[PDB]
Design a binder for this molecule. Structure first.
Ligand SMILES: NC[C@@H]1O[C@H](O[C@H]2[C@@H](O)[C@H](O[C@@H]3[C@@H](O)[C@H](N)C[C@H](N)[C@H]3O[C@H]3O[C@H](CO)[C@@H](O)[C@H](O)[C@H]3N)O[C@@H]2CO)[C@H](N)[C@@H](O)[C@@H]1O
Ligand SMILES: [Mg+2]
Ligand SMILES: [Mg+2]
Ligand SMILES: [Mg+2]
Ligand SMILES: [Mg+2]
Ligand SMILES: [Mg+2]
Ligand SMILES: [Mg+2]
Ligand SMILES: [Mg+2]
Ligand SMILES: [Mg+2]
Ligand SMILES: [Mg+2]
Ligand SMILES: [Mg+2]
Ligand SMILES: [Mg+2]
Ligand SMILES: [Mg+2]
Ligand SMILES: [Mg+2]
Ligand SMILES: [Mg+2]
Ligand SMILES: [Mg+2]
Ligand SMILES: [Mg+2]
Ligand SMILES: [Mg+2]
Ligand SMILES: [Mg+2]
Ligand SMILES: [Mg+2]
Ligand SMILES: [Mg+2]
Ligand SMILES: [Mg+2]
Ligand SMILES: [Mg+2]
Ligand SMILES: [Mg+2]
Ligand SMILES: [Mg+2]
Ligand SMILES: [Mg+2]
Ligand SMILES: [Mg+2]
Ligand SMILES: [Mg+2]
Ligand SMILES: [Mg+2]
Ligand SMILES: [Mg+2]
Ligand SMILES: [Mg+2]
Ligand SMILES: [Mg+2]
Ligand SMILES: [Mg+2]
Ligand SMILES: [Mg+2]
Ligand SMILES: [Mg+2]
Ligand SMILES: [Mg+2]
Ligand SMILES: [Mg+2]
Ligand SMILES: [Mg+2]
Ligand SMILES: [Mg+2]
Ligand SMILES: [Mg+2]
Ligand SMILES: [Mg+2]
Ligand SMILES: [Mg+2]
Ligand SMILES: [Mg+2]
Ligand SMILES: [Mg+2]
Ligand SMILES: [Mg+2]
Ligand SMILES: [Mg+2]
Ligand SMILES: [Mg+2]
Ligand SMILES: [Mg+2]
Ligand SMILES: [Mg+2]
Ligand SMILES: [Mg+2]
Ligand SMILES: [Mg+2]
Ligand SMILES: [Mg+2]
Ligand SMILES: [Mg+2]
Ligand SMILES: [Mg+2]
Ligand SMILES: [Mg+2]
Ligand SMILES: [Mg+2]
Ligand SMILES: [Mg+2]
Ligand SMILES: [Mg+2]
Ligand SMILES: [Mg+2]
Ligand SMILES: [Mg+2]
Ligand SMILES: [Mg+2]
Ligand SMILES: [Mg+2]
Ligand SMILES: [Mg+2]
Ligand SMILES: [Mg+2]
Ligand SMILES: [Mg+2]
Ligand SMILES: [Mg+2]
Ligand SMILES: [Mg+2]
Ligand SMILES: [Mg+2]
Ligand SMILES: [Mg+2]
Ligand SMILES: [Mg+2]
Ligand SMILES: [Mg+2]
Ligand SMILES: [Mg+2]
Ligand SMILES: [Mg+2]
Ligand SMILES: [Mg+2]
Ligand SMILES: [Mg+2]
Ligand SMILES: [Mg+2]
Ligand SMILES: [Mg+2]
Ligand SMILES: [Mg+2]
Ligand SMILES: [Mg+2]
Ligand SMILES: [Mg+2]
Ligand SMILES: [Mg+2]
Ligand SMILES: [Mg+2]
Ligand SMILES: [Mg+2]
Ligand SMILES: [Mg+2]
Ligand SMILES: [Mg+2]
Ligand SMILES: [Mg+2]
Ligand SMILES: [Mg+2]
Ligand SMILES: [Mg+2]
Ligand SMILES: [Mg+2]
Ligand SMILES: [Mg+2]
Ligand SMILES: [Mg+2]
Ligand SMILES: [Mg+2]
Ligand SMILES: [Mg+2]
Ligand SMILES: [Mg+2]
Ligand SMILES: [Mg+2]
Ligand SMILES: [Mg+2]
Ligand SMILES: [Mg+2]
Ligand SMILES: [Mg+2]
Ligand SMILES: [Mg+2]
Ligand SMILES: [Mg+2]
Ligand SMILES: [Mg+2]
Ligand SMILES: [Mg+2]
Ligand SMILES: [Mg+2]
Ligand SMILES: [Mg+2]
Ligand SMILES: [Mg+2]
Ligand SMILES: [Mg+2]
Ligand SMILES: [Mg+2]
Ligand SMILES: [Mg+2]
Ligand SMILES: [Mg+2]
Ligand SMILES: [Mg+2]
Ligand SMILES: [Mg+2]
Ligand SMILES: [Mg+2]
Ligand SMILES: [Mg+2]
Ligand SMILES: [Mg+2]
Ligand SMILES: [Mg+2]
Ligand SMILES: [Mg+2]
Ligand SMILES: [Mg+2]
Ligand SMILES: [Mg+2]
Ligand SMILES: [Mg+2]
Lengths: 124, 138
RNA sequence: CAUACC
RNA sequence: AUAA
RNA sequence: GCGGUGAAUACGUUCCCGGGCCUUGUACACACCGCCCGUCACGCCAUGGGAGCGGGCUCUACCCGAAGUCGCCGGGAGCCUACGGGCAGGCGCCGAGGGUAGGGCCCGUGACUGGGGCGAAGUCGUAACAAGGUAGCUGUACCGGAAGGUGCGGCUGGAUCACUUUCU
RNA sequence: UGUGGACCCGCCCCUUGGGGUGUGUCCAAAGGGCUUUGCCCGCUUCCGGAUGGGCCCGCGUCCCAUCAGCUAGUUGGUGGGGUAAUGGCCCACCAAGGCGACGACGGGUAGCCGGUCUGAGAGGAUGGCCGGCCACAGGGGCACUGAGACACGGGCCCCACUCCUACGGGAGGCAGCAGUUAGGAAUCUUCCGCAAUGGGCGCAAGCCUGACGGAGCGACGCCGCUUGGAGGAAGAAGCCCUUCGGGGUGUAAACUCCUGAACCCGGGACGAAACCCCCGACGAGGGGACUGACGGUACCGGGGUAAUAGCGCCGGCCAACUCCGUGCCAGCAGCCGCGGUAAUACGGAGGGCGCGAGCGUUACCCGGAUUCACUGGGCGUAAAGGGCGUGUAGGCGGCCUGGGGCGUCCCAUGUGAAAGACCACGGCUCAACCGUGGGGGAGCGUGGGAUACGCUCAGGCUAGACGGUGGGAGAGGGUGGUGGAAUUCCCGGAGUAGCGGUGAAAUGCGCAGAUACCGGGAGGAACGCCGAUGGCGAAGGCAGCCACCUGGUCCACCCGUGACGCUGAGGCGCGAAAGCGUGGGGAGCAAACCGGAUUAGAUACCCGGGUAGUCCACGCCCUAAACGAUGCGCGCUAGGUCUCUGGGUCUCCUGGGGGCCGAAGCUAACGCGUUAAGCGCGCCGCCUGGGGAGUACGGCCGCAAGGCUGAAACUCAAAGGAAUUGACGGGGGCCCGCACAAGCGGUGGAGCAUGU
């Protein structure tokens, strides 16, 4: 635009809306499972995907994903969610922390251990 | 109407050179003329002169180019590679002496208008003033 | 090729 | 019908 | 594989099937057995309207009004006095807040209800893309399970021109 | 008592209530200690200093205009009250003012700053440690006492909450240090000491300081440091791979020697010299004594053990590949994407890469993002030119001269605290950390100067703009009038068996005589040829002919005015079609509708009917593919050719307008190219990935239908433009083939053979 116009109006700065209202800003948020489900992916994917509907201390009902091959979450399990969209299930934006609260660490896992949250296999 | 008569000239010149005219006519003003004085001095033109078209006063500028060149396209190098208005109406640009720009590491000039009169970049800095930055030429 | 329904 |  | 006997017909290129070259249009590229549209069914999600309930903030008028300063009185109507005056007390303005009436705004909740967006392989047709087989798109108006159709006018971002002929 | 000060009135200087001066009036005090006639500490009044404050002003300080009007102590006056002091701070009376698009009023959000993070910078984000200011002390008011408070550990009252209660009544206030509990993803010891520094009172000795100096917990952060160092096979074992030869882990290990974190013993701090006391004088100066929380710590000396390694990753981006398991499952995934039986992408293993007392994850800020572009973007077709005008504010403005000096530039000077940031030299063994010094600094204040450009004032000019005179072309607009062709209907004539319509038909019309044909009439609507390669208009749009009314325009003369100019948020007007209201009209056409066909169906295309509507007047509506999908103005930059309309010396020259081709140049390309999409300047409008959505909400407008303005949640990795090569078309053109056609013999039926 003309300068007189920038003078008159000006450039409007950009607002950047969150990808993840885990309120507080906070890194994570605790909630309870109010159902464990299986979900079908989309696009060129097929499998049965473990999710939970969680009701949060944020006072928010969001659907989290339950990573790992084995999971132990039930229709009253308390859990810690943590943000991280699952690319295939639309509307699944947060992940669940494996190793915190009711959620068990993955079992007999030896590689990417601290995600999945499993201790250190012990011997000599 | 003619809103900026300086840009008109600056441009009039830019236009003429890109088709390699021998000379071009700008309608005349002392201030326009006081610029051509510098263009001329610093080697960008061959000089100018007050001609007179249809009984109204013009400044004929005499343009200056390179030598003919090699390969396809023999059109010569331009002397005024580049020439552009800095300060304009509704955006006047003024600079302190500590802010007069080094154009192309001095390979080009920057005419500016001070209370000691119209002057090159080197001229004002080595003379201690600042003013309205008119235009870069390189 | 591997699948899905009538 | 669906995926390559 | 081999010899013996030994024909008919071909005007023509309009139709049917394939193929070559040039050109045009294209939303096709696993290339028309392509692409694609909308209703509908199943499922997940956020959301508009909403009678009525619960809560907060504010404004206008009227009324009650603590504390406290300030003002008036301070009286044979209490205390002190050097008679000048002080104090106690009393009234009044203001005044936190409260209440009655009307209005404006903000959040929760909610019977009922409208559409939305997503989710390999459910249903109906086939609107669009090739002149998409009635050029398309468009403002508006009416009509129809659905894409849509028709009127009127506009645009070219239409191939250029001889009964309907869906899907892959 | 009156040094002196305060108050009224007068006078001088000053210029706001500052400083003198005269009369009048008013106003002072406190004692205490001794080494006891002199010192120490106090008290009183006045003047000055220092330090700390109050108040006022210029400029700067987030988002929403889907918040455009706001204000009654409101705005000013006079006189009062009040205060340390100005002031509608408060009060009475008087005037009717004050503020707002330069964003008032309302709403939303927020303590502000030095600084901090990021960034090449401009910018963006932030205000956590520390320092400055402000505000608050359960919530709301209020004053008292004081130099100072409207007072966190002071007072009163109202409210809410906990506690005591003999039922009337009382008591509390951690957002001081610790600590408990609650909420949360999450945040410390109910520690030590007044030794240092600082504060309060005291003459002092001292006392009081949860200020503070220290220790404690937490890898939370930075910095430093260790888990060893040199030798050691042509290369153990195990695990891995293999072309069955081998190759890998790998000098790694074992093992040889060497230092010696941990740990033990001994010495053991700096921080602390003042206050006090003595000589001198209670001064300067000299002498003396006391004091350590941290802490038996830091540090120094001797003794001395081979003595923690994790986490992430290895499809591309992005350093690092091989087996097994799995089979669109189980799973991965920041984006693109991996997995459907040979997965370097999933799970394990060997190996490898990267960091390492850490390594990853999630969250948030800047960056890359010139992706809000001032630096540093765009709008013909990708998102974006307002439907068009007229014009308000505002922005911008030709040539010459003079004044001023607002902008602009320059010199000097004041301010820019410390911390932090930059550089040097230093202190802890280094660093982290800290000390000393230097350097820079935006911005504002003052004094002096410059005057080109911008501004303003005063003159001047004619080249921009307008005017005058003469001449022109036009479907430009409004009103009245009028012309012929056709369709339809009505009357008459003649004439008889159909007409119509389609791919084929039917519905339909026709013996009450239609269709065709002739003559007469009524009407409604639209104007053939001329006619486009045309013209006019700002756009929408405008075409029979005549007249009147009226708008724009172009040329010649170079006559007049003298910068009067451009653009233009709001406003106001105009605005195809459809649609609406009130009357009128109604030939033809025709949404809806009623029928006939077609079809698998056919709520369609085809056919026969047909209402609104199409027409008029008046009033609304305000939209569009309202398109050149290209805002208006001006200047500049080869030419050729066709055309419309002026002028001139009329083979041609010179204007205005409409096309085509093309120089330079531009463009992603297509294209544009003196009718720019080139080169430039002024101004307006608009864009910021797709969907949700031109939706919801709010406002405004409308009789309505709706229009204008116009989001968010949620959701995707695309959506797009141009071109390229194909393939394709129920697109074109050209052309073949027993492809059809022209022929002659077959199969399909029968019985059987053979294959399925
Ligand atoms: N998101 C689609 C929106 O709704 C419509 O599309 C929606 C429906 O029409 C459509 O339905 C299609 C159907 O057309 C088609 N013939 C069959 C198909 N299985 C369906 O698909 C749907 O349903 C199945 C389960 O039944 C889901 O697994 C699948 O994800 C979903 N797309 O599925 C869509 C919802 O995902 C509009 N056409 C479209 O324009 C609009 O964008
Ligand atoms: Mg993430
Ligand atoms: Mg992984
Ligand atoms: Mg063919
Ligand atoms: Mg050939
Ligand atoms: Mg071809
Ligand atoms: Mg070819
Ligand atoms: Mg081709
Ligand atoms: Mg098809
Ligand atoms: Mg609601
Ligand atoms: Mg209420
Ligand atoms: Mg009262
Ligand atoms: Mg009272
Ligand atoms: Mg009283
Ligand atoms: Mg009240
Ligand atoms: Mg179709
Ligand atoms: Mg088809
Ligand atoms: Mg089409
Ligand atoms: Mg309807
Ligand atoms: Mg449509
Ligand atoms: Mg219809
Ligand atoms: Mg049409
Ligand atoms: Mg006296
Ligand atoms: Mg006196
Ligand atoms: Mg005076
Ligand atoms: Mg006096
Ligand atoms: Mg006295
Ligand atoms: Mg005494
Ligand atoms: Mg002072
Ligand atoms: Mg008043
Ligand atoms: Mg006063
Ligand atoms: Mg007053
Ligand atoms: Mg405001
Ligand atoms: Mg605050
Ligand atoms: Mg800042
Ligand atoms: Mg940048
Ligand atoms: Mg803090
Ligand atoms: Mg702070
Ligand atoms: Mg509290
Ligand atoms: Mg307290
Ligand atoms: Mg808790
Ligand atoms: Mg102390
Ligand atoms: Mg002390
Ligand atoms: Mg070694
Ligand atoms: Mg030793
Ligand atoms: Mg040894
Ligand atoms: Mg002491
Ligand atoms: Mg002595
Ligand atoms: Mg001494
Ligand atoms: Mg060892
Ligand atoms: Mg690599
Ligand atoms: Mg193998
Ligand atoms: Mg499985
Ligand atoms: Mg495998
Ligand atoms: Mg594979
Ligand atoms: Mg692998
Ligand atoms: Mg990977
Ligand atoms: Mg960078
Ligand atoms: Mg940026
Ligand atoms: Mg852009
Ligand atoms: Mg388009
Ligand atoms: Mg566009
Ligand atoms: Mg336009
Ligand atoms: Mg409009
Ligand atoms: Mg438009
Ligand atoms: Mg205008
Ligand atoms: Mg103006
Ligand atoms: Mg001006
Ligand atoms: Mg000027
Ligand atoms: Mg001047
Ligand atoms: Mg000045
Ligand atoms: Mg500083
Ligand atoms: Mg910096
Ligand atoms: Mg050092
Ligand atoms: Mg320093
Ligand atoms: Mg200054
Ligand atoms: Mg100055
Ligand atoms: Mg001067
Ligand atoms: Mg003048
Ligand atoms: Mg005239
Ligand atoms: Mg006309
Ligand atoms: Mg008749
Ligand atoms: Mg007869
Ligand atoms: Mg009949
Ligand atoms: Mg008969
Ligand atoms: Mg007839
Ligand atoms: Mg007749
Ligand atoms: Mg009639
Ligand atoms: Mg034309
Ligand atoms: Mg035109
Ligand atoms: Mg048109
Ligand atoms: Mg006229
Ligand atoms: Mg003249
Ligand atoms: Mg004159
Ligand atoms: Mg209209
Ligand atoms: Mg109409
Ligand atoms: Mg009507
Ligand atoms: Mg009628
Ligand atoms: Mg009809
Ligand atoms: Mg019909
Ligand atoms: Mg009607
Ligand atoms: Mg009308
Ligand atoms: Mg002629
Ligand atoms: Mg022309
Ligand atoms: Mg070119
Ligand atoms: Mg090109
Ligand atoms: Mg061209
Ligand atoms: Mg131009
Ligand atoms: Mg362009
Ligand atoms: Mg727009
Ligand atoms: Mg969008
Ligand atoms: Mg969007
Ligand atoms: Mg609309
Ligand atoms: Mg609305
Ligand atoms: Mg209404
Ligand atoms: Mg394309
Ligand atoms: Mg073809
Ligand atoms: Mg044949
Ligand atoms: Mg047989």
């Amino acid at each position: 635009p003309t300068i007189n116009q920038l003078v008159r109006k000006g450039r409007e700065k950009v607002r950047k809306k969150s990808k993840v209202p885990a309120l507080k800003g906070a890194p994570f948020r605790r909630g309870v499972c109010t159902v464990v489900r299986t979900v079908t992916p989309k696009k060129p994917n097929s499998a049965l995907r473990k999710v939970a509907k969680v009701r949060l201390t944020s006072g928010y009902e969001v659907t989290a994903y339950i990573p790992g091959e084995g999971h132990n979450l039930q229709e009253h399990s308390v859990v810690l969610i943590r943000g991280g969209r699952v690319k295939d299930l639309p509307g699944v934006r947060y992940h669940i922390v494996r190793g915190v609260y009711d959620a068990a660490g993955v079992k007999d896992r030896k590689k990417s251990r601290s995600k999945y949250g499993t201790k250190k296999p012990k011997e000599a | 109407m003619l809103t900026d008569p300086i840009a008109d000239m600056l441009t009039r010149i830019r236009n003429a050179t890109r088709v390699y005219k021998e000379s071009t006519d700008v309608p005349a003003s002392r201030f326009k003329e006081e610029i051509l004085r510098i263009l001329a001095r610093e080697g960008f033109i061959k000089g100018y002169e007050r001609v007179d078209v249809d009984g109204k006063p013009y400044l004929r500028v005499y343009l200056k180019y390179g030598p003919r060149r090699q390969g396809p396209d023999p059109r010569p190098e331009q002397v005024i590679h580049h020439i552009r208005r800095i300060s304009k109406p509704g955006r006047r640009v003024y600079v302190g002496v500590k802010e007069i720009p080094r154009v192309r590491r001095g390979l080009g000039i920057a005419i500016l208008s001070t209370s000691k009169g119209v002057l090159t970049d080197r001229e004002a800095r080595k003379l201690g003033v600042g003013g309205e930055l008119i235009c870069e030429v390189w």
